[PDB]
Amino acid sequence: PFVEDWDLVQTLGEGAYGEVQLAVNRVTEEAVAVKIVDMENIKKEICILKMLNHENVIKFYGHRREGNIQYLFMELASGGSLFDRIEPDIGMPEPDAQRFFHQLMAGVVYLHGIGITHRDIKPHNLLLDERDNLKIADYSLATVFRYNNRERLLNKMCGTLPYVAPELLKRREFHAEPVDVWSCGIVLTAMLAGELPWDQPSDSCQEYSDWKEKKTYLNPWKKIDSAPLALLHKILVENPSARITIPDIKKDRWYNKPLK
Ligand SMILES: COc1cc(C(=O)N2CCC(N3CCN(C)CC3)CC2)ccc1Nc1ncc2c(n1)N(C)c1ccccc1C(=O)N2C
Predict the structure, then answer these.
(1) How far apart are CA 130 and CA 19, in angstroms?
(2) Comparing 1-87 with 88-260, is the CATH topology the same?
(3) Which CATH number fits domain 88-260: 3.40.50.1980, 1.10.510.10, 1.20.210.10, 3.40.50.10490?
(4) Which ligand 1 atom is the nearest neighbour of the CA of 58?
(5) Which of 38, 89, 120, 252 does the annotation list as catalytic?
(6) Are 168 and 134 spatial neighbours (Cβ–Cβ below 8 Å)?
(7) How far is Cα 63 from Cα 49, in angstroms, rounded to an integer?
(8) Which residue is closest in CA terms to ligand 1's atom 24?
(9) How many CB atoms within 10 Å of residue 118?
(10) CA 132 / ligand 1 centre spacing (Å)
């Protein structure tokens, strides 16, 4: 249970995406997080990880290959996930939701400005430092959507169905940025209502159909105050070229509303 200087002291998370361990240097005591994969894909991931330098995105410290097992050393977010701050059926107080949303948007503006799309934004991947600062984590699905100032459209299916934008189920090719925006709106919904509005955004999904018919007397929308709900009406728009952009989210009334 050791890699060079570091003792791998406990299991922080697991999955087909390897596992994540708490790592404590015996010399220096600096604690970090290490992702361990039993090993194309990771080469890309590491590459993306090395571009990342922003306070709302998990830092990459470096990596080590040891035969089959790659170790990736990353910022430790000692407050865990946003998922665990969401109370089922209630959400969280609106001012915390707002602050987290602000921080999410800063993170996403940054990724997009370096031409990176995350592609799987959801509360499980939004981690908290010890002062409750939100960090966007897990770049195993991320990719480059802008290079030498030329945009490339995406075609791969990536994501988690309740968070995924409807164009991804319906279009041969799609712009990257409105996909991540959509998912941020699902996150905001989850934060304010403690429940996901649909299993996936298709027309065979009744709850999705009801939203498009504006039945906001139903759950989860009935739990959400009118100011953030109006912003949700701009984000969760089925046509991705009519959907609100981040610069325009920044001008939204609820976004700029002072709160407790
Ligand atoms: C000390 O920091 C963390 C604490 C917790 C957390 O509250 N728990 C609760 C108790 C849990 N169990 C211990 C074992 N026991 C049998 C059951 C209970 C261990 C983890 C969760 C995450 C923590 N920090 C952390 N930072 C960066 C990550 C990352 N996670 N992982 C797991 C990621 C998760 C999702 C997406 C990306 C990451 C990640 O890449 N990093 C770097």
Answers:
(1) 22
(2) no
(3) 1.10.510.10
(4) 42
(5) 120
(6) no
(7) 10
(8) 77
(9) 27
(10) 14
209, containing H or E segment: helix 206-212
Ligand 1 pocket, 9 CB below 6 A?
no
Q: How far is the CA of 52 from the centre of ligand 1 (A)?
A: 20
Resolution, Å (one decimal):
2.1
Ligand 1 centre distance from Cα of residue 194 (Å): 21
- Between 3.30.200.20, 3.40.30.20, 3.90.930.1, 3.20.20.450, what CATH number should domain 1-87 receive? 3.30.200.20
What technique determined this structure?
Answer: X-ray
**Nearest Cα to 181, choosing from 123, 245, 127, 239?**
245
* Token pair recorded at residue 28: 């220096």
Instruction: Decide: 76 in ligand 1 pocket, CB within 6 A.
Output: yes
